[PDB]
Design an enzyme around this catalytic site. Structure first.
Site, mmCIF file in Angstrom:
data_model
loop_
_atom_site.group_PDB
_atom_site.id
_atom_site.type_symbol
_atom_site.label_atom_id
_atom_site.label_comp_id
_atom_site.label_asym_id
_atom_site.label_seq_id
_atom_site.Cartn_x
_atom_site.Cartn_y
_atom_site.Cartn_z
ATOM 1 N N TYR A 168 -3.789 -2.195 -8.151
ATOM 2 C CA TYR A 168 -4.791 -1.527 -8.976
ATOM 3 C C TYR A 168 -4.457 -1.576 -10.466
ATOM 4 C CZ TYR A 168 -5.568 0.766 -4.418
ATOM 5 O OH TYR A 168 -5.766 1.031 -3.098
ATOM 6 N N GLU A 191 -12.867 1.414 -3.087
ATOM 7 C CA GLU A 191 -12.767 0.650 -1.858
ATOM 8 C C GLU A 191 -12.402 1.573 -0.690
ATOM 9 O OE1 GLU A 191 -11.008 -1.899 1.287
ATOM 10 O OE2 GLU A 191 -10.062 -0.323 0.030
ATOM 11 N N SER A 192 -12.974 1.295 0.492
ATOM 12 C CA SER A 192 -12.664 2.002 1.748
ATOM 13 C C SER A 192 -12.918 3.497 1.564
ATOM 14 C CB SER A 192 -11.255 1.598 2.182
ATOM 15 O OG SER A 192 -10.709 2.502 3.128
ATOM 16 N N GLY A 216 -7.907 6.230 3.526
ATOM 17 C CA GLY A 216 -8.294 7.081 4.668
ATOM 18 C C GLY A 216 -8.333 8.559 4.358
ATOM 19 N N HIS A 241 -9.559 -6.169 5.755
ATOM 20 C CA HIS A 241 -9.859 -4.985 4.962
ATOM 21 C C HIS A 241 -8.888 -4.814 3.792
ATOM 22 C CE1 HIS A 241 -11.900 -1.106 4.673
ATOM 23 N NE2 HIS A 241 -10.732 -0.494 4.579
ATOM 24 N N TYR A 271 -7.332 -5.753 10.739
ATOM 25 C CA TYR A 271 -6.138 -4.985 10.300
ATOM 26 C C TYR A 271 -5.923 -3.752 11.176
ATOM 27 C CZ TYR A 271 -3.071 -3.684 6.250
ATOM 28 O OH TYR A 271 -2.021 -3.395 5.432
ATOM 29 N N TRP A 310 0.794 -1.227 0.000
ATOM 30 C CA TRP A 310 0.000 0.000 0.000
ATOM 31 C C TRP A 310 0.830 1.282 0.000
ATOM 32 C CZ3 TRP A 310 -4.534 -1.880 -0.958
ATOM 33 C CH2 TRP A 310 -4.909 -3.102 -0.395
ATOM 34 N N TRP A 354 -0.483 -11.576 6.181
ATOM 35 C CA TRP A 354 -0.922 -11.295 7.544
ATOM 36 C C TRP A 354 -1.284 -12.594 8.274
ATOM 37 C CZ3 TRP A 354 -0.208 -6.537 9.530
ATOM 38 C CH2 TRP A 354 -0.052 -5.477 8.629
ATOM 39 N N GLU A 406 -13.714 -7.142 8.787
ATOM 40 C CA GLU A 406 -13.409 -5.712 8.511
ATOM 41 C C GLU A 406 -12.494 -5.004 9.513
ATOM 42 O OE1 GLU A 406 -13.974 -3.678 6.024
ATOM 43 O OE2 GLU A 406 -15.249 -4.793 4.689
HETATM 44 C C1 LIG Z 1 0.691 6.553 12.185
HETATM 45 O O1 LIG Z 1 -0.443 6.468 13.036
HETATM 46 C C2 LIG Z 1 -1.490 5.717 12.576
HETATM 47 C C3 LIG Z 1 -1.527 5.094 11.340
HETATM 48 C C4 LIG Z 1 -2.655 4.364 10.995
HETATM 49 C C5 LIG Z 1 -3.729 4.294 11.874
HETATM 50 C C6 LIG Z 1 -3.709 4.913 13.118
HETATM 51 C C7 LIG Z 1 -2.590 5.628 13.464
HETATM 52 O O2 LIG Z 1 -2.445 6.305 14.638
HETATM 53 C C8 LIG Z 1 -3.562 6.298 15.522
HETATM 54 C C9 LIG Z 1 -4.773 3.451 11.283
HETATM 55 O O3 LIG Z 1 -5.936 3.343 11.639
HETATM 56 C C10 LIG Z 1 -4.130 2.683 10.140
HETATM 57 C C11 LIG Z 1 -5.174 2.298 9.104
HETATM 58 C C12 LIG Z 1 -4.962 1.432 7.865
HETATM 59 F F1 LIG Z 1 -6.055 1.822 7.041
HETATM 60 C C13 LIG Z 1 -5.105 -0.065 8.052
HETATM 61 C C14 LIG Z 1 -5.159 -0.711 6.671
HETATM 62 N N1 LIG Z 1 -3.948 -0.418 5.889
HETATM 63 C C15 LIG Z 1 -3.954 -1.069 4.566
HETATM 64 C C16 LIG Z 1 -4.886 -0.511 3.515
HETATM 65 C C17 LIG Z 1 -6.123 -1.083 3.284
HETATM 66 C C18 LIG Z 1 -6.975 -0.576 2.315
HETATM 67 C C19 LIG Z 1 -6.542 0.488 1.571
HETATM 68 F F2 LIG Z 1 -7.364 0.994 0.613
HETATM 69 C C20 LIG Z 1 -5.318 1.068 1.743
HETATM 70 C C21 LIG Z 1 -4.482 0.541 2.713
HETATM 71 C C22 LIG Z 1 -3.669 1.019 5.781
HETATM 72 C C23 LIG Z 1 -3.662 1.704 7.131
HETATM 73 C C24 LIG Z 1 -2.953 3.597 9.728
#
Ligand SMILES: COc1cc2c(cc1OC)C(=O)[C@@H](CC1(F)CCN(Cc3ccc(F)cc3)CC1)C2
Ligand SMILES: *[C@@H]1O[C@H](CO[C@@H]2O[C@@H](C)[C@@H](O)[C@@H](O)[C@@H]2O)[C@@H](O[C@@H]2O[C@H](CO)[C@@H](O)[C@H](O)[C@H]2NC(C)=O)[C@H](O)[C@H]1NC(C)=O
Ligand SMILES: *[C@@H]1O[C@H](CO[C@@H]2O[C@@H](C)[C@@H](O)[C@@H](O)[C@@H]2O)[C@@H](O[C@@H]2O[C@H](CO)[C@@H](O)[C@H](O)[C@H]2NC(C)=O)[C@H](O)[C@H]1NC(C)=O
Ligand SMILES: COc1cc2c(cc1OC)C(=O)[C@@H](CC1(F)CCN(Cc3ccc(F)cc3)CC1)C2
Lengths: 530, 530
Positions: B130, B199-200, B119, B438, B328, B83, B430, B325
């Site tokens: 992709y 997605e997401s 996000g 997810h 991860y 990613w 994983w 969901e």
């Molecule tokens: C530095 O601090 C933090 C970093 C992150 C969070 C919280 C943090 O601090 C509180 C999270 O909740 C992480 C959330 C994630 F989405 C989990 C899933 N992957 C893979 C993925 C899946 C689908 C996609 F379309 C694109 C990528 C990306 C990261 C990151």
């Protein structure tokens, strides 16, 4: 004259009667006075002990039923009539009953003291279903039961006043228990092995004696059937007690607590009874007008607080419920319910019924109830809605209060045994959709199936004999298990083990509706406080 | 030279590149500029259309990735690196990509437009997962994907201000969709048949274009994978957006809205990225700092409100979720969780993770969560607590937002198709306890298992071909089912039918976690209102 039927107690001489049971004879002393008649000036006051008498009191039949409302919901129907008074109504009603083996025992024998239910507004020790001849013959115990005042006469409270202090019906029970201590040895009973047992409001009464120190010295073991003192219907706060008492006075024409009570004593007993159900604050089921009050005397705090803070080491308790605790209540005011159809309610009727079954909570609380008891894959299905409402009412009022008590008592020193009663009597006259309703395990505990004039199956008679054996084993030893022989495990807060009682042998199950009771005992109180 | 790879669009001339797949070639036009570079004084401003150019733009490789945070949680781990950006970071990043069959279709081909997730803080159209070559060769569609600004560059908002209005990353997406309307015919695509899919946060973006009238005329059908615009993470209110932008300015040394944005515009992009996570109000997982704002412009009201009040007749939507969901997200800040052990958390860890997974709710609301996700027959069991907390994060953030959107759209005239993706990829790096996490359905939608240099099984390749057929059927006709041939039913508010996607044939099921979603979608909002 038969000398087995002659007994002297501290008050004077009593004459009893030899009763015939299928298995042999039993001595019975029915209608023993234990208080001065609480009439005229003594209405609403604590009971005074019976003054001693000359001669012989004939204790040969049940005395009068305490004044009470008489159920008229299905007139002449067996299912409602079996609970109704079978003796004259009177305020002269403070009498108790002793059944003992024939001939009377020579070795001190364990005692069972029965406290009837009936919502604190009704009940009598003379009901056919509380006949104690079968238990005394089969298990050789002494059995005691008493009348105590109900409704306004037993529980009307103007808290703080001399003239209507409240809780006098519980004081009737306490006086009966002191009488057992001073006198039961005259019948061959053992005052150092006394087991209280009761059902519904009687079960709640047994629990309040547990939590009230002046009563706690009068017994050693307890059985609570389908009731608990922490139930949302079993107590009321001082303010709501006074509001209800004051509304009753106004409705019967009465105007200073002394003068209000003095005007209430001039009213005919039936006039009070006729206005009892009108003082309730909301449309409801399983809610009663005059119940024990938390005034700091009989109960120092609420039963929930006294349970949570109690040390119960040295106590044994047997607790249980029937399989369908709330079904009977729905025909008394929930929309769409009858004993004469299948009561297949609509969704609007269910939502309406939830507010009748969970009265006096916030709209938000009501919505949490609807959340937890709706099946969101089938939110309209009438049969599912019907059992759902039955479970709401049964969980809220009986199952979850009992489970909370069992869990606290076990964690705080008591040995607890728990059951779910699952047999539907072959003779039951209520509709099949009600399952095993509130109150239908009592006949099996008292061995009413062994009466030949009733039409129980032979299996039901064997089941009765099993249940009487568990109850008397518990009374004798603090343990329902057969001393030398399928085991009934103790209930503990962790494993939460209980047994099913039906025609099959004991099966151990885990969790007294644990997910449901997590809502009622943990989340709902927090929601109400915010 | 190859005439198939020379294309003229409104702004000028492009040179593409032929790409190979196991099924034959594909034409690719990569790195087409669709906006002026949003740099210097254009930082934080809405995109503006790319001025025409002379000469031939080289469209044979992917262009830069918009500045974004780079995940360093498990450095060098395939699971996280797949990613991360695979091109240089630059603010000059507003390019899009077109993949078309070779030789170019000479007759109008349905168009799929991909919006990436991340996000609203991360993502890139150039990621290997992709790659559009496989869907284009097997399903004969035109595939377009675009880069849009993320993090502070795309969503920092001082609401009402001229200099940082908010939502400019969504306006980048809208501009690319307008570009498609004007130019996709030059590649053989039919601008009257555009399906959006994402997605997401890409799914949330799709949903937001559904609810914004200026976007709604630029496509005809929508696919929402594991995301929804009504997700608690996908929007922020004006007050909190202003607070977040203001704290970012402070954290990077900056001081009036005009004066504040000017100092932020002088800061290197990487400086803004470095402080991004520090403006979040509470310890959290699945929460992002700069996301779409409800300001009355792109979104007139909150997405939940625009959904409840919409007429969606004429709309076909494909929506779905993966089987696990929330798994991860737990490795990014829930106590006791790691990819490298079994994450067998304790009850105290479970209670602390509820506050990280449900941030910014009252303590009463958190109790409610713990009520519904504890097994009270097993409150301490670590494996059950691990899965329970995964269900909390997954249900709160994805499954129940998606189920709400599906039910409302269906009951208001949309034709909805719903799935649960239940296949765990054999190449997944994983741990086994996260199940199907997810994002791990995307590679199957794009037919990556057909690439031979990757190590997927033979019947995973067949699975991928099935899903590409479903998605492309839906793009062509609004119905995933094979037109002339196990049927996928529409999802309705009543029957709530959906299918499971895995190596087995379609199996129809009922209700997307209907019990759990009643709590989040019905009860929990009423609780927060009181
Ligand atoms: C530095 O601090 C933090 C970093 C992150 C969070 C919280 C943090 O601090 C509180 C999270 O909740 C992480 C959330 C994630 F989405 C989990 C899933 N992957 C893979 C993925 C899946 C689908 C996609 F379309 C694109 C990528 C990306 C990261 C990151
Ligand atoms: C089940 O019966 C209830 C109660 O109705 C009473 O008992 C019936 C056997 C019949 O004799 C009725 O006439 C009695 O009134 C039904 O609920 C009642 O419905 C009537 C409309 O006919 C209405 O006027 C009453 O208010 C309702 N009473 C209550 C307590 O809700 C109910 O509809 C029946 N369910 C069926 C037939 O499925
Ligand atoms: C599973 O691992 C977590 C995370 O610990 C990290 O990863 C491990 C593989 C190991 O390398 C640890 O040293 C790492 O710190 C464990 O939770 C951590 O426990 C340590 C105590 O050893 C504590 O200091 C950390 O704060 C904890 N981190 C979090 C996020 O809670 C967890 O105990 C492991 N579970 C097991 C072993 O069952
Ligand atoms: C006049 O109005 C109302 C009358 C009643 C209610 C409500 C009323 O108005 C709102 C109720 O909820 C009823 C409650 C009942 F408990 C239901 C079943 N028992 C049988 C039974 C079981 C066990 C026993 F130990 C003793 C008796 C009878 C009464 C009465």
């Amino acid at each position: 004259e038969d000398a087995e039927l002659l007994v002297t107690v501290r008050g004077g001489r009593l004459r009893g009667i030899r009763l015939k049971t299928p298995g042999g004879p039993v001595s019975a002393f029915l209608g023993i006075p234990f208080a001065e008649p609480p009439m005229g000036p003594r209405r609403f006051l604590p009971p005074e002990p019976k003054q001693p008498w000359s001669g012989v009191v004939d204790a040969t039949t049940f005395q009068s039923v305490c004044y009470q409302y008489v159920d008229t919901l299905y007139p002449g129907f067996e299912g409602t009539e079996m609970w109704n008074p079978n003796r004259e109504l009177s305020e002269d009603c403070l009498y108790l009953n002793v059944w003992t083996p024939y001939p009377r025992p020579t070795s001190p024998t364990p005692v069972l003291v029965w406290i009837y239910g009936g919502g604190f507004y009704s009940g009598a020790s003379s009901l056919d279903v509380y006949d104690g001849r079968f238990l005394v013959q089969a298990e050789r115990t002494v059995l005691v039961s008493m009348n105590y005042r109900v409704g306004a006469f037993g529980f009307l409270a103007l808290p703080g006043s001399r003239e209507a202090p409240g809780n006098v019906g519980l004081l009737d029970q306490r006086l009966a228990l002191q009488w057992v201590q001073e006198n039961v040895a005259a019948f061959g009973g053992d005052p150092t092995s006394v087991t209280l047992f009761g059902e519904s409001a009687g079960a709640a009464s047994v629990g309040m004696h547990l939590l009230s120190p002046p009563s706690r010295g009068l017994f050693h073991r307890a059985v609570l059937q389908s009731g608990a003192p922490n139930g949302p219907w079993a107590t009321v706060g001082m303010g709501e007690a006074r509001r209800r008492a004051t509304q009753l006075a106004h409705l019967v024409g009465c105007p200073n607590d002394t003068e209000l009570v003095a005007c209430l004593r001039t009213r005919p007993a039936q006039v009070l009874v006729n206005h009892e159900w009108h003082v309730l604050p909301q449309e409801s089921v399983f809610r009663f007008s005059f119940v024990p009050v938390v005034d700091g005397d009989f109960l120092s705090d609420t039963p929930e607080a006294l349970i949570n803070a109690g040390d119960f080491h040295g106590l044994q308790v047997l607790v249980g419920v029937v399989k369908d605790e709330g079904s009977y209540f729905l025909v008394y005011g929930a929309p769409g319910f009858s004993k004469d159809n299948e009561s297949l309610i609509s969704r609007a009727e269910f939502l309406a019924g939830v507010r009748v079954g969970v009265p006096q909570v916030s709209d938000l609380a009501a919505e949490a109830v609807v959340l937890h008891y709706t099946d969101w894959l089938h939110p309209e299905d009438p049969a599912r809605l019907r059992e759902a409402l039955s479970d709401v009412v049964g969980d809220h009022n009986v199952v979850c209060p009992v489970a909370q008590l069992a869990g606290r008592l076990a964690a705080q020193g008591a040995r607890v045994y728990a059951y779910v009663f699952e047999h539907r009597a072959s003779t039951l006259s209520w509709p099949l959709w009600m399952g095993v309703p509130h109150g239908y395990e009592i006949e099996f505990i008292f061995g009413i199936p062994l009466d030949p004039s009733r039409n129980y199956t032979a299996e039901e008679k064997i089941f009765a004999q099993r249940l009487m054996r568990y109850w008397a084993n518990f009374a004798r030893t603090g343990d329902p298990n057969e001393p030398r022989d399928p085991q009934w495990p103790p209930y503990t807060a962790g494993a939460q083990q209980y047994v099913s009682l039906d025609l099959r042998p004991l099966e151990v199950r885990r969790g007294l509706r644990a997910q449901a009771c997590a809502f009622w005992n943990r989340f709902l109180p927090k929601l109400l406080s915010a």
